[PDB]
């Protein structure tokens, strides 16, 4: 009689379909998904330091809009900008807005140090009804609106040395009056000119008198500029009118900080990978949630599923 | 005696050489080419909507050069710009030319809507001998050259609200006169200044009086600018001279439109993939015709041939 | 009795560990390194034409700083800029510095041809104590500082046609005086304006009077500009003051030239691949020395070692 001895292998009743080099559909005993396609829907507050902008853009928090005073000197790994944010101060623009937003976002700090600028012979601390704090007229917290003192605006020629070990970031501006009479009334002379320089760089800005459409009832504008001053260099501001003056400087750091546009709620939880849709797990190598990411994240791909076989071909009975 | 039974495989007298991981030259029974290396030499008019610029650059068709009146309000999937195209109107430049060309190309339409700007107190519709239509003096069709009315040019302070559901694109300009006397003669005052604003943006441009080399016998220049106005925003033009005024706005759309530089003839035929050399078949995954493509195209690679084996090793008798 | 015949394979006592698709550590009999991780520490002078900037940036060699006269008309495949380089002429800036540096670097030549500009009615060849040659006052060799002649500066309206077969690169500038009295004293009128044009392009620059921090005891500045003039086009310079005039043009070539920041010594040796750390051998496909390369170089990767098996699995006795 003898015996029979058969060699074989397992199979399962519920196999899974994968792709190969020779066949788009072959059933294997088991597989694992390599594309992360879902989010929790919230941004976990840990382990990255999250700063929710709430009503404030980063730039409004920088300048010191009245809704943004709670942001002073705060730091972040990720600043989260909300689509509902809006300005509630004097109407302004920033030539190169994207670059200023980016460099501050990347620096990851709003640390500000006041300095004693000698604004000899002018009126300081100008305010406006378009920028209220607690119903009083106010202005951007970090800027100083200078105007005539007894119908004189003597030329400004003011120095601030950087004897620090770090770079200083200065934010300053130019006021564009609506009319010639408004120019004379604020600055006591027909036009201004502003030259802000260091040993390595110079910027000159000319105010442009005229009507723009009213925003918070104001037809004039402020245009915002910035200047970085290296250790051992010197800031020189030379102006005859229209200067929106700095009150001091911001620290610039380098590191891992960034900014993200999202309306996802912030939650008490821990997740390394952030997207605008919310935090996502980062076990998988790929993800199709969002091209926009921050942290230790899977790589964005177009596929919504990629199954890796983790078993042999399934050959059911 | 018994029998003999031999196992074997086919071969061919005309095998083809392919590359592998271990050998740069191995003969197989058959192969297929993966790189498309030839074109028909013409651009097929189907299935993409092709617009041949002929004598006109896209920007000349936009502004309304006298050779380009047939382009009014036309749409395209691909605008084809010819190397022979040249301007035949007033000499101009466009700071950022590449960006204006790109954004119009991508929008894919020259749809234009006239609007009723109230140009109170000036002469409209200025023309020039450098921009003839049918031997008369003429000008860019979409622009309005304003000059003094009885030696006055009163300040312009003109509004145009966008109460549409779409964005509006405005094209406008500044005239740079050749001399101080030409400035006075056209605008009745020593200089102009132009500020074009919305609630979100502002641009001011200063005319620059002086000689440039003569082009179509003109030593002055026009410089072209643009402004996009969102729904619920308002265009404000404020100027004292030198304004080359808009006559209305262009629609801006988003979609699949582009622009290509080519001198290939347009033909009656159907091909999904367009290159500057002509349309190419798109069965192959790769191509070495041109890095510049439009449509469903193979991917550009440096290799001129890549043969994929489609049979076994060829082992001839 | 019979015989025994065993099939087998070699092994070695000193195998090497490699990575595979199924195992991060498997021992093979032999392997070869695919990542170049060391440099000689010097830049080999062959076979690329190397130009050591020494004390000179490329831009200082272009303009003609007093420390850079030995660079006149020199050509390079690779211009090597040293971190110790510093300027020793009139303090200047270049809006777009990076682009001018890049285009000259890529052109690979400082070939300069003097031209006879007719500067009618002004004093030529102005000099300064901030730009000495051999203790005399001097200036940038390739620039011509024009000032009043007997308290007149009549308007300049000067032409230079390009009747060559190649493009011409013109470098020119604007002087920004420290004060109104300095402006009058040099140019005999209250301000200048400079318009430099061709048939295709125009640039106008306004001098900006004011104090900048002293550099080599000078509080004024020069700002540098450039203009390319195609064959059959014409350069037109129109100015009433403050012009830092060209003396002629640079040839612009196209080819394989570039620029590299490095403090590595130049040596007498032959190596195709240059990095800032020094030349590296280029037998390997990859390297982790520097992302910055010039010549026939391995590709930069993050790994510091990648071992390719060149033998079978090692199975010791
Ligand atoms: C189909 O094929 C897949 C892939 O092979 C199988 O999925 C694996 O299943 C095993 C067993 O369930 C999983 O193992 C468990 O996950 C963790 C593994 O530890 C590593 O990964 C985690 C991430 O979760 C890291 O944080 C960690 O540092 C390790 O690198 C453990 O958390 C689990 O722990 C449990 O067992 C241990 C044993 O000591 C205990 O300490 C704990 O109490 C706990 O109960 C466990 O080890 C593995 O994660 C799965 N991989 C994937 C990719 O999903 C399927 O099982 C298979 N299906 C079938 C039917 O065969
Ligand atoms: C060497 O190796 C190559 C690659 O395997 C072989 O080339 C193939 O040859 C076959 C047979 O000639 C070709 O088949 C023909 O092409 C079309 C295939 O249909 C698909 O592809 C077309 C693109 O052309 C798509 O539009 C379509 O939707 C399909 O996805 C058909 O158009 C042809 O149709 C003919 O036969 C059918 C049969 O029903 C009829 O309906 C028609 O009347 C018509 O006569 C046909 O099927 C195939 O395209 C070739 N592939 C490639 C990549 O070239 C060589 O044959 C082989 N050489 C040797 C000597 O063995
Ligand atoms: C472990 O595995 C590695 C990889 O297989 C082996 O390394 C190879 O070893 C051989 C033998 O020593 C090396 O061969 C020598 O290198 C040159 C080969 O010529 C080509 O490559 C050079 C670059 O060096 C090119 O310039 C040239 O154009 C060729 O493309 C030759 O320079 C050497 O020449 C010597 O022998 C010839 C024989 O005719 C003579 O003319 C000369 O006099 C001279 O003495 C020689 O051919 C090969 O380069 C190595 N490759 C690598 C990648 O390192 C190890 O040998 C192996 N180890 C063990 C223990 O098995
Ligand atoms: C130049 O043109 C602009 C734009 O048309 C003019 O601005 C407009 O000025 C009027 C008159 O002051 C503004 O009216 C105000 O509206 C508010 C809002 O309801 C109201 O509270 C005030 O009582 C007043 O009615 C109008 O808002 C403003 N329009 C825009 C778009 O800004 C400007 O007056 C013109 N200048 C001259 C000198 O003509
Ligand atoms: C400032 O410099 C420019 C450039 O040299 C001068 O422009 C030149 O002006 C002359 C005189 O009008 C032009 O001559 C004309 O040439 C045409 C072409 O054949 C001809 O049809 C006319 O009858 C006349 O001869 C010349 O073309 C022009 N050159 C360029 C390059 O534009 C300008 O005159 C100077 N201005 C002053 C005030 O000196
Ligand atoms: C406008 O503000 C600037 C900056 O404070 C003033 O520039 C400064 O001018 C003084 C007076 O000439 C310079 O002093 C000089 O220092 C050198 C260096 O040791 C020395 O050799 C001279 O004898 C003299 O003491 C000073 O260097 C300079 N500072 C900077 C940062 O450039 C300028 O004077 C002010 N202008 C007016 C009209 O007030
Ligand atoms: C640069 O700063 C200087 C120093 O105050 C200014 O020059 C003075 O300007 C006033 C008013 O215009 C004149 O009365 C003085 O005679 C000037 N002094 C000197 C030494 O020239 C100058 O106006 C400043 N520039 C700008 C753009 O504000
Ligand atoms: C995560 O959010 C992104 C961003 O909105 C979503 O991507 C958009 O998906 C819609 C379809 O609902 C498309 O119309 C848009 O093209 C996508 N937006 C952009 C800006 O490209 C995505 O659906 C979300 N993913 C998950 C898993 O929630
Ligand atoms: C901005 O528009 C206003 C409104 O017309 C202009 O201001 C007037 O300018 C004229 C002529 O220069 C003066 O006579 C009026 O007194 C001004 N009116 C007011 C209310 O100030 C102004 O010129 C325009 N700006 C530009 C750059 O064109
Ligand atoms: C398609 O057109 C391109 C564009 O001109 C051709 O590529 C050029 O080829 C010439 C050789 O005749 C080279 O000198 C140039 O470097 C290429 N041009 C550019 C701009 O890089 C190409 O030969 C054409 N291909 C086919 C298949 O017709
Ligand atoms: C452009 O060049 C012309 C030609 O010299 C200059 O125009 C002359 O300017 C002088 C002095 O300002 C006047 O006296 C003449 O009447 C002008 N001539 C003409 C024909 O207008 C003009 O100043 C130059 N522009 C610049 C910016 O320098
Ligand atoms: C070649 O030079 C580069 C450039 O400095 C070196 O890379 C730097 O390595 C240091 C560590 O000593 C890091 O802190 C820096 O991040 C690197 N620099 C930059 C600018 O990224 C590199 O070490 C050198 N490699 C060799 C083989 O000598
Ligand atoms: C510093 C100063 O003088 N501020 C005044 C401003 C400016 O004159 C204009 O805003 C300039 O355009 O105007 C107000 O109507 C305002 O904005 O509230 C009153 C305010 O006191
Ligand atoms: C609107 C207007 O006044 N147009 C006139 C222009 C301008 O004066 C200059 O072109 C400005 O530079 O000059 C002409 O010689 C021309 O170009 O044909 C006559 C023409 O009637
Ligand atoms: C051409 C000319 O007039 N050069 C003079 C300059 C300029 O007046 C200023 O540098 C302009 O800012 O000033 C000097 O002190 C200098 O720099 O050496 C004296 C020099 O002879
Ligand atoms: C098959 O069934 C087992 C037991 O219910 C389960 O654990 C396994 O994961 C199932 N299917 C797939 C596709 O993973
Ligand atoms: C933000 O603004 C809205 C009004 O637009 C208000 O309801 C909300 O309380 C504000 N929150 C903060 C923190 O300023
Ligand atoms: C070999 O010959 C056959 C018949 O002539 C042909 O169809 C085949 O495609 C030939 N060669 C190659 C390289 O394809
Ligand atoms: C285009 O311009 C050339 C002259 O340069 C002319 O021959 C041709 O007829 C013109 N065609 C059109 C459509 O304007
Ligand atoms: C092993 O030893 C031989 C002879 O000493 C040597 O040539 C070989 O390269 C050695 N090891 C490795 C890791 O290459
Ligand atoms: C470069 O400058 C330094 C002084 O900073 C000097 O020692 C050296 O000799 C100079 N060399 C040349 C070639 O100018
Ligand atoms: C200017 O200097 C050059 C030498 O650099 C000389 O040829 C020329 O004659 C000088 N011109 C004047 C007007 O001084």
CATH architecture field of one domain in chain A: Alpha-Beta Complex
Describe the global form of chain A.
elongated
| Share of β-strand residues of chain A | 35-45%
The biggest beta sheet of chain A is recorded as: 7 strands, mixed
DSSP strand tally of chain A: 29
Kindly report the name of the CATH homologous superfamily of one domain in chain A: Haemagglutinin, alpha/beta domain, HA1 chain
CATH topology of one domain in chain A: Hemagglutinin (Ha1 Chain), Chain: A, domain 1
Bound molecules: a molecule of 5 linked components (NAG-NAG-BMA-MAN-MAN), a molecule of 3 linked components (NAG-NAG-BMA), a molecule of 2 linked components (NAG-NAG), N-acetyl-alpha-neuraminic acid, 2-acetamido-2-deoxy-beta-D-glucopyranose
Give the chain pair forming the largest contact, with residue counts. A-B, 10 and 15 residues
What is the share of helical residues of chain A? under 10%
Count of helices of chain A?
3
Assembly of the depicted chains: homotrimer
Structural class of the helix and strand makeup of chain A? mainly beta
Distance between the termini of chain A: 27 Å
Give the CATH level 1 class of one domain in chain A: Alpha Beta
Any chance you could write out the topology, listing elements then pairs?
Three copies of one chain form a homotrimer.
Chain A: E1 16-18, E2 26-28, E3 31-33, E4 35-36, E5 43-46, E6 50-52, H1 58-63, E7 78-81, E8 92-93, H2 97-107, E9 112-114, E10 122-123, E11 128-133, E12 136-138, E13 143-145, E14 147-148, E15 156-161, E16 168-176, H3 180-187, E17 194-197, E18 202-205, E19 221-229, E20 234-239, E21 243-246, E22 248-251, E23 258-261, E24 266-270, E25 273-275, E26 278-280, E27 286-287, E28 299-300, E29 307-309
Parallel strand pairs in A: 4-27, 5-24, 6-7, 7-23, 8-19, 27-28
Antiparallel strand pairs in A: 1-2, 3-29, 9-22, 10-14, 11-12, 13-21, 15-20, 16-19, 16-21, 16-22, 17-18, 17-20, 25-26
The structure holds a molecule of 5 linked components (NAG-NAG-BMA-MAN-MAN) (3 copies), a molecule of 3 linked components (NAG-NAG-BMA) (3 copies), a molecule of 2 linked components (NAG-NAG) (6 copies), N-acetyl-alpha-neuraminic acid (3 copies) and 2-acetamido-2-deoxy-beta-D-glucopyranose (7 copies).
